[PDB]
Write a protein that binds this ligand. Structure first.
Ligand SMILES: C[C@H]1O[C@H](O[C@H]2[C@H](O)[C@@H](O)[C@H](O)O[C@@H]2CO)[C@H](O)[C@@H](O)[C@@H]1N[C@H]1C=C(CO)[C@@H](O[C@H]2O[C@H](CO)[C@@H](O)[C@H](O)[C@H]2O)[C@H](O)[C@H]1O
Ligand code: CA
Ligand code: CA
Length: 686
């Protein structure tokens, strides 16, 4: 089907996501509203339920509020049943309005709707070519005190009505009981509890299998994407086996939230987007966009350096979800902030690389500080605000112009307050000019673009004071003055004669899974897909058309491969690298090694004979292992995704800089479980 189709669950670069807090959008069914102390119909106590639901979203899709804006994907609050308690935290009452305090991952939150209401939402969104992304928060259940079992619902987890267990007297060890995190280390943030939430123990086989069973249930209901909460607070090896469960079953676009502060660049963050099998909410983008367009704490050279730096640091930058604010930030618009600042920041996000997300109420200029004040009920459904019109004119270009959905980003003109960049994909191009200075016009001289000659009209129709661009020979533009606050977008689309790959989804799966390769210029007739030098042709190519190919992963050994497409005429595409072929289905095994004493700067790692363990390469070994919370030094431990049902060979090693010290003796062997969990507990062999 085409790359822009609503049925494309794997890749979202052609979409614009509207992020809805279900409770704060529209109460379409008053009969499902919480009663008593859990409800506030005026929505002035922002920690109570206001009444918004799935019928309210169905209504705003039907009457054209969302589709008039050009939205093609909706991201809603976690749909699962939550605790019913009103918890009083030092005077103020709190409810699960936000969907994050789960008690049954197999049932719906009835304040939002019934399972029939969820089905009706999937089907009415799809009939209007809107994809549906759900939050999924598998790190915890709800507020709990094992010392006081009467507090809230004591973190109890149910499985479709059946109690699996609570936090007090957890003889099954369904939960973690190591105390609360001080966030000092990533290790500390993973196994210790955050706030008062009952942390799930993913090394318990029942919890592992249950969470994997529950995500497949929501995939069977037709969801198109998953946003997973608190990814830096769950074992990276368990999350990799969780992604393999999704990708080897029904692959959908998945991304997580790993929060970064202003001008924080974390290698672990980039490593997670590049290796987990999921992408990330692009905080690096969001924070620099706020410094330049909102806070004025950096200028356009900072913006340029972030766009240029992130194109390299993210192995698949077209999968990162961008935004200028969301549920974990103060709203972009401030009380004394010029609305043009919000309007330019939205135009910047909508024409940039990645998958744009707009937080509900941006188009109505909502302001508010941090939680809960950034989650007020949206005040109006006015269809005529400038911000609504800016999204309406620009959001369609992600479907119609492949330079915007997939293209590279090239700075063509810049100074402290102005940037003009070009997006380019084959011969499709979009050029965007932004002057953030609200009182000084900018004289543009010397602009050269990849546009053919013509008089290009601003796609924004001059509403943000843009102008026509006259382009002559060699892509040279005639000089112009960019108005104060001016933003203009100019574009040209045409056919690709040669194959170009813009995006691939999923990026990690076992042999036989169908992956989706999107781009332009593939042609009508089936050609060849290369995974490395292995060619797959004929019946293994499930679908071929000019913008999308669906092909089965060949039976190649586990490892990472370059993908390349050749059309029927033998013309080959660009390489899309970093694809990981798994050895098979995954299970997460806890590896524990005792008596492994180390020097300062020396850490313990694991490697072995399958690609998941780095294929005996010390530079690709698993670790550094942990050694503080679950087990303490000199015992080291780590949760590692490993192929299910087979005998692996492995050894531990110590690494300090360039020096590797391998365990002596024979190679260790272990037969892994077919999907469930397991622990290996061994002693260092000198
Ligand atoms: C649990 C929180 O998770 C998300 O934010 C994460 C992010 O995904 C991580 O990878 C990142 O690195 O750390 C962030 C912080 O954990 C999500 O976006 C947050 O909004 C989410 N917050 C929830 C959960 C709770 C905790 O029960 C609520 O806070 C309550 O807890 C405190 C202390 O007990 C009380 O004083 C408050 O009054 C409670 O509301 C939040 O309301 C809710 O937003
Ligand atoms: Ca309601
Ligand atoms: Ca955790």
């Amino acid at each position: 089907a085409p790359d822009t189709s609503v049925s494309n669950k794997q890749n979202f670069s052609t979409d614009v996501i509207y992020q809805i807090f279900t409770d704060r959008f529209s109460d379409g069914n008053p009969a499902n509203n919480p009663t008593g102390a859990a409800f506030d119909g005026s929505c002035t106590n922002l920690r109570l339920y206001c009444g918004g639901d799935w019928q309210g979203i169905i209504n705003k899709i039907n009457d054209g509020y969302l589709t008039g804006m050009g939205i093609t994907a909706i991201w809603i609050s976690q749909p699962v049943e939550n605790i019913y308690s009103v918890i009083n935290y030092s005077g103020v009452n709190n409810t699960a309005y936000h969907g994050y305090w789960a008690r049954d991952f197999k049932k719906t939150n009835p304040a939002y709707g019934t399972m029939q209401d969820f089905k009706n939402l999937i089907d009415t969104a799809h009939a209007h070519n809107i994809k549906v992304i759900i939050d999924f928060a598998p790190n915890h259940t709800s507020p709990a005190s094992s010392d006081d079992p009467s507090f809230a619902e004591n973190g109890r987890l149910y499985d479709n009505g059946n109690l699996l267990g609570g936090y007090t007297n957890d003889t099954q060890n369904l939960f973690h009981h190591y105390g609360g995190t001080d966030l000092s280390t990533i290790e500390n943030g993973i196994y210790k509890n955050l706030y008062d939430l009952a942390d799930l123990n993913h090394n318990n086989s029942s919890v592992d299998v249950y969470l994997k069973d529950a995500i497949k249930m929501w995939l069977d209901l037709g969801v198109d994407g998953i946003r997973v909460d608190a990814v830096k607070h769950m074992p990276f090896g368990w999350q990799k086996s969780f992604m393999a469960t999704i990708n080897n079953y029904k692959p959908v676009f998945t991304f997580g939230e790993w929060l970064l502060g202003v001008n924080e660049i974390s290698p672990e963050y980039h490593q997670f987007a590049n290796e987990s099998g999921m992408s990330l909410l692009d905080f690096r983008f969001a924070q620099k966009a706020r410094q330049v367009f909102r806070d004025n704490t950096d200028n356009m050279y900072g913006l340029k350096a972030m766009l240029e730096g992130s194109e390299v640091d993210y192995a698949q930058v077209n999968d990162q979800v961008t935004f200028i604010d969301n549920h974990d930030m103060e709203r972009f618009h401030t009380s004394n902030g010029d609305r043009r600042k919000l309007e330019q920041a939205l135009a910047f996000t909508l024409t940039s690389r990645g998958v744009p997300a707009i937080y509900y109420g941006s188009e109505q200029y909502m302001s508010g500080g941090n939680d809960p004040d950034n989650r007020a009920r949206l005040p109006s459904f006015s269809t005529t605000t400038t911000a609504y019109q800016v999204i309406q004119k620009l959001a369609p270009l992600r479907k119609s112009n492949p330079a915007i959905a997939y293209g590279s980003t090239h700075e063509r003109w810049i100074n402290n307050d102005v940037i003009i960049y070009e997006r380019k994909f084959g011969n499709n191009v979009a050029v965007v000019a932004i002057n953030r200075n609200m009182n000084t016009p900018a004289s543009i001289t010397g602009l050269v673009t990849s546009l053919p000659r013509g008089s290009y009209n601003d796609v924004l129709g001059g509403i943000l004071n843009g102008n026509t661009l006259t382009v002559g020979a060699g892509g040279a533009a005639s000089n112009f003055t960019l108005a104060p606050g001016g933003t203009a977008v100019w574009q040209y689309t045409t056919d690709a004669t040669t194959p170009i790959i813009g995006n691939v989804g999923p990026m990690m799966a076992k042999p036989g899974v169908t992956i989706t390769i999107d781009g332009r210029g593939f042609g009508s007739g089936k050609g060849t897909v290369y995974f490395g030098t292995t060619a797959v042709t004929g019946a293994d190519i499930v679908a071929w058309e000019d913008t999308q190919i669906q092909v089965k992963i060949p039976a190649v050994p586990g490892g990472i491969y370059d993908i390349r497409v050749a059309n029927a005429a033998g013309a080959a595409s660009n390489i899309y690298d970093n694809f990981e072929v798994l050895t098979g289905d995954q299970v997460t095994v806890r590896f524990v090694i005792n008596n492994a004493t180390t020097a300062l700067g020396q850490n313990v790692f694991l490697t072995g004979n399958v690609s998941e363990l780095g294929n005996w390469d010390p530079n690709n070994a698993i670790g550094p292992m942990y050694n503080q919370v679950v087990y303490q030094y000199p015992t080291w431990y780590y949760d590692v995704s490993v192929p299910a049902g087979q005998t692996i060979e492995f050894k531990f090693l110590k690494k300090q800089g360039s020096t590797v010290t391998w365990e002596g003796g024979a190679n260790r062997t272990f037969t892994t479980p077919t999907s469930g969990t397991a622990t290996v507990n061994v002693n260092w062999q000198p």
